[PDB]
Write a protein that binds this ligand. Structure first.
Ligand SMILES: CC(=O)N[C@H]1[C@H]([C@H](O)[C@H](O)CO)O[C@H](P(=O)(O)O)C[C@@H]1O
Ligand SMILES: CC(=O)N[C@H]1[C@H]([C@H](O)[C@H](O)CO)O[C@H](P(=O)(O)O)C[C@@H]1O
Ligand SMILES: CC(=O)N[C@H]1[C@H]([C@H](O)[C@H](O)CO)O[C@H](P(=O)(O)O)C[C@@H]1O
Ligand SMILES: CC(=O)N[C@H]1[C@H]([C@H](O)[C@H](O)CO)O[C@H](P(=O)(O)O)C[C@@H]1O
Ligand SMILES: *[C@@H]1O[C@H](CO)[C@@H](O)[C@H](O)[C@H]1NC(C)=O
Ligand SMILES: *[C@@H]1O[C@H](CO)[C@@H](O)[C@H](O)[C@H]1NC(C)=O
Ligand SMILES: *[C@@H]1O[C@H](CO)[C@@H](O)[C@H](O)[C@H]1NC(C)=O
Ligand SMILES: *[C@@H]1O[C@H](CO)[C@@H](O)[C@H](O)[C@H]1NC(C)=O
Ligand SMILES: [Ca+2]
Ligand SMILES: [Ca+2]
Ligand SMILES: [Ca+2]
Ligand SMILES: [Ca+2]
Ligand SMILES: [Ca+2]
Lengths: 390, 390, 390, 390
């Protein structure tokens, strides 16, 4: 049998560089002959010998006739789909995994675990598939839109950790973590700390004993909730990030939130899922983050890094590393993932570039990928090249 | 060599939940650039490492110009086709197995067995393919439209059991079972009991010694014929189901048929293939069924369960478990199948949702899948999302 | 390494039955969204674990704009292409093997051998590819359109035999056979007997020591040239078939050619490649043939069988076995091939059904397949279902 | 683990012959239903069991709406893509490897190495991918459009050699060679000799100790720079080819450049990447080259051969071997590659046939392949068959 997967030391590098752009709508012209799927919330998850590009589709293509409702978030048509990283997600190239309006996926070194949530809002359901089999489900506990990550889950030794949350977008949404093995929930983990609102966590391995996540708090602050989950004891604690470099959107000027680390500041109602990925060295730990260039709008995307320290307590500003997407371009959700190289892991940040043209036309997205490679400074940005009027 | 397949104990679960929807016609708009095939009578059959989604196509696509005749059942163009479960059955994604206007398929743990019937009505022919080779055939015995299951066949130890029938849709159609091994018929089985009319059986393993099937009687009753085939002796007996919860369509009010179990009641001419799948426990046996919400029309689909007892004699009503498809939606054929998980089998029910718009336009279908997963109550229904006018 | 392939005994059966229809032009409507390739001269060749459907394309699709010249036979655009048997040969599904306006292919149990002829008419060239590598070539010897089989080549123990010919369509075209091993010509074989005109041979194994072929004589007779190639000595002899059942098209009434077996009769200028496949039994040898229903036109196709005897000397009429294609349908080239089953070989006959609508529109073909299966009589015919005006 | 790859002796042959034509735009008609990608700079690279056809796409298809800018060379949309040799490079068939406006790729016998350059002109970046992982990068040293080969890199024992260059198209562009192993740069090689301008080298193994390349000098001569890289010492020297048969375009009459081998002659500003491939014999060494038929324009393509001698010093004219593409047809870039046969290597020359119709329409290319096969003389030329107005 294939051995289980474990996080390794990251590959040598000191900078991220532009790697790949998946812009399916460059082939959606009325005049063309292609069938790109209408998606949102894309992410990437890799196994030992291949990366898959997942997304939640509206079960419709461009060109097409089912544009009405593609801006709506939850419905009975949404499905979690995927293609091998590098292929254009078309009607024919995609595989439909399950019905879901919220998802996640990960590989334990032996098989794929697909997570998808659906069901009525007041009683949603987390469904789990292992390979080709439907294995387990989890019920809503706050009866207000149970939902999950929108990024990869994290496995170690055959145990995969996943964040789920339930609650009001504008109130309390206390999250929990699920310990899954071979498609079945073996443990339920209730976190400690600042818990009032945690959603859309982007998690990763900081080491073999700790999983860290940068999340979204949709109602109380522009500071991102940060999770430390001890895999050894299966205990999690959450505290807000202390950096002057607020990573949520919308947000106020940097360092404008006065008070100790724990101070929420103004509500700044709303948020965005943020990119976060680890760079593990024998001695150091690099934490890479991404945020929109606009404090108010989903445009642009900047890279930031920060070595060592403690996110829960360091107030210091993060170090700008580069502009991945300019303000003229869409900068929506971002996520982190790692590519498995021969003897080391490669950290990457993916970016969702949504083509928004209103409620009267289609609504979909491109996915730009940036990975740690070589040294130097980040050289080039990403554009989608799509004219929504074609 | 790979070992043969045997039924195992079902996976832990106490409820079915919405799993997947294959709606190819969401990409058939005149405006689109896709080629979904025109099909009917879909089913699913799984091997140890993959499920295939089979159907009988009219060898035509939407958009297209061969809509005339797609409502006709038998012709010289129909073919048995398949895609891996999860892929949209398009012109290019499908594999054409053989010419057939009635089919079945199953995997013995080593190879695929494709069954397809064609030939003139008065002298049809059951043809058998094993992998890439045409291996055997079976002739018509009643000379009135020989036909088969329209669902998976069942294998154990390399022996696959298949139901075939021959006879008048409005009269006697006595069925037989064929014992096949490696593509060749090794035995012919003539059942005992109530035999006047049995067709379109949905069979499954109740254990390693018994195969049970819920069938359709098209001319004498709204009660479904139920088969018990002893794999050990190769003997089969048939008796009608005694439940007050009549599973055929059309049908009369529940429990309206007076008399002992054997009473047919009024003719209620016509029928529908029904879903039926087993849930095997160490001590118990769960029997899951599906039927249309309308007593008269092919709309809606309800799930029902019943633990233990004897179908041939228990008059008790089945226990409603959920609405998989509302009355506003099409509820046509349904079938059962099982997904092979690492150490247990997963029972599922598939539903054919036909887009019927008359004899002047195309006629095709979506396939909704529900599988046993987790506990609780069934949460959400399925809709096709197709506007036949696009 | 995989062992080499050898002919085995055929599988049990006493009749051919309709198996499969590949009609790509059912998806070529102006209104559709497909891309079937424009082809002619299709054939099938099988390895141990898969059959491939080959053809010579005009490097154009329907719908499209390169219909002018698709009725022309040789040009610089033609290519030998293939798909796995069962897939529709589309622009994307096909693999382009090499430039050729005449082809052949076969598998030795380890790898594929692709044969393709191209080059100017007065100095054509047989090119040989083994797997992904171009291995050998053969020059024109009569400088008048060197060409090959248009059906599978035959391998035994790693040695593959192929018929090539050169000469005037209306005069002498003496054929030769090439002994190839691992992509390179190891021997050249010059046949004895009646050699004035042999082309488009359909060859097969009658046993482990003899390869027999039914060929076409385009200028001197309506009787088909018949080859007996002794694999042991690498010697070939050719004599005309003596049957009253003339297998070429055009042809005169049956048994109308007076004189001994060797008499050519009237010229009946022209011909057609004919189907021919062996049924090997421990004691007997069945020879199956196919010919058009019309003596003058390429419409319809009949099956015939003949057990034992000697084709070179038996004048007896062949035994009609069935109508595979009615006179209302196109009956062009036919070929034979064998499917490898677990422990026996399955003989099949393929039929080219060309959609001819003149020099002003596209010109392409469907492929119908009939294989030996079960017993009884041949039940059903094949139709293409294509309306050339769509 | 699979053993590393090493150059072997070439397969027996004495001539090149027409092998294959990949003309994706034969399926790009407004009327068609296909999606060929818009590309330029195609090349081929083979592993032990498969060849891949690479190219730099403009991330647009025909028919489509993104033709403006497809004649521009560098931008943020270009990507290195590939298909298995033989498949039409369509939107769905292609795999997108990375963002790059200049590329190269090669296989070491265990894995694929993808090279792609992008970034701003004054600070471009060579990025390296090994399999699915981004492994290394290389910075610009002359800050004037760092770029690479546009043909396969060359591996031996797990070490792959690649040419990169930097500098003014109209001035000095001193090249360097990178020694890469498993995706990471292990050595940097600075060549000796005539170094003022070397770009777009077409390299190959002349033996296990020497890699030779025919390159382009865009500003000082119509004579091609020729590299001899000793793999044993990792030292490279460059000198101009001495042949009277000038291989660049534009160029003056043959032998019109007076003076010793080293004389540049007139500037003849501009160039073209040229085909070059080795034919290794136990005693001899054949060097095959290709050049446009027109001295001034990119039309036509001729083959030339030359056995033994020393390119740096032999003034003798090369021996014309054939016309692969006539003057009526486009003859743009050409490259060499080798197919791995069972026990020998097969040398081939690929040709880029660009469909140029101005800056107001699409700009893309066909790829014709010629390989060493059999003996005799080169028989047939290649045409694209594309009408740019459809
Ligand atoms: C399960 C779900 O509905 N997720 C949706 C979330 C959700 O509103 C917030 O997490 C608050 O709970 O909103 C985002 P957006 O509009 O901010 O892009 C789109 C998601 O599809
Ligand atoms: C072989 C065949 O013809 N099967 C057809 C059956 C058949 O009429 C009944 O089983 C009675 O024999 O009807 C159904 P339906 O119209 O009820 O959906 C469609 C099937 O294609
Ligand atoms: C190599 C070649 O040209 N083959 C062609 C042959 C050829 O004329 C005859 O064999 C006489 O040599 O004709 C047939 P058809 O028109 O009879 O269908 C079409 C083939 O493409
Ligand atoms: C990296 C790059 O820009 N390469 C381009 C080169 C380049 O100008 C010359 O090598 C001079 O440096 O030109 C060619 P062309 O127009 O001659 O076909 C097209 C290439 O895309
Ligand atoms: C995690 O543990 C495994 C051994 O159990 C080891 O091979 C791997 O390198 C460890 N990861 C880190 C970051 O040390
Ligand atoms: C059927 O028999 C096999 C052993 O022959 C066993 O492994 C399997 O679990 C049995 N099935 C059931 C339901 O007991
Ligand atoms: C041909 O020879 C091989 C052994 O060399 C044998 O297995 C095969 O059955 C033979 N074929 C026939 C028709 O006897
Ligand atoms: C290169 O070296 C390997 C052994 O290291 C050998 O097998 C191969 O044939 C050599 N190549 C040539 C051209 O001699
Ligand atoms: Ca917020
Ligand atoms: Ca396709
Ligand atoms: Ca009934
Ligand atoms: Ca003739
Ligand atoms: Ca020059």
């Amino acid at each position: 049998e294939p051995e289980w997967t474990y996080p390794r030391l990251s590959c040598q590098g000191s900078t991220f560089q532009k790697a790949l752009l998946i812009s399916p709508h460059r082939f959606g012209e009325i005049k063309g002959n292609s069938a790109p799927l209408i998606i949102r919330e894309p992410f990437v998850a890799c196994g030992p010998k291949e990366c898959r590009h997942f997304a939640l589709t509206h079960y419709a293509a461009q060109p097409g006739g089912y544009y009405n409702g593609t801006r709506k978030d939850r419905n009975k048509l949404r499905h979690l789909v995927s293609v091998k990283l590098g292929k254009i997600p078309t009607v024919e190239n995609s595989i439909f995994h399950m019905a879901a309006w919220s998802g996640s996926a990960c590989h334990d070194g032996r098989e794929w675990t697909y997570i998808g949530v659906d069901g009525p809002d007041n009683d949603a359901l987390v469904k789990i598939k292992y390979g080709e089999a439907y294995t387990d489900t989890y019920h809503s506990y706050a009866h207000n839109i149970l939902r999950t990550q929108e990024s990869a889950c994290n496995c170690i030794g055959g145990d995969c950790y996943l964040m789920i949350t339930d609650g009001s977008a504008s109130g309390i949404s206390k999250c929990r973590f699920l310990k899954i093995r071979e498609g079945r929930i073996i443990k339920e983990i209730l976190p400690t700390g600042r818990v009032e609102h945690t959603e859309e966590c982007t998690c990763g391995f900081a080491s073999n004993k700790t999983i860290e996540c940068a999340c979204r708090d949709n109602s109380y602050t522009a500071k991102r909730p940060f999770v430390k989950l001890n895999v050894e004891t299966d205990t999690a604690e959450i505290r807000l990030m202390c950096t002057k470099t607020y990573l949520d959107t919308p947000r106020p000027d940097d360092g404008s939130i006065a008070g100790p680390c724990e101070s929420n500041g103004d509500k700044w109602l709303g948020g965005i899922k943020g990119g976060f990925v680890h760079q593990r060295m024998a001695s150091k730990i690099g934490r890479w983050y991404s945020r929109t260039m606009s404090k108010t709008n989903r445009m642009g995307m900047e890279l930031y890094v920060r070595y060592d320290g403690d996110p829960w307590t360091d107030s210091d500003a993060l170090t700008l590393s580069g502009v991945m997407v300019s303000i003229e371009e869409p900068g929506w959700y971002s996520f982190g993932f790692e590519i498995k190289d021969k003897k080391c892991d490669v950290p990457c940040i993916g970016i969702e570039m949504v083509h928004d043209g209103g409620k009267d036309t289609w609504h979909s997205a491109a996915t730009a990928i940036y990975c740690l490679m070589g040294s130097g400074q980040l050289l080039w940005d990403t554009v989608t090249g799509v004219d929504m009027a074609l």
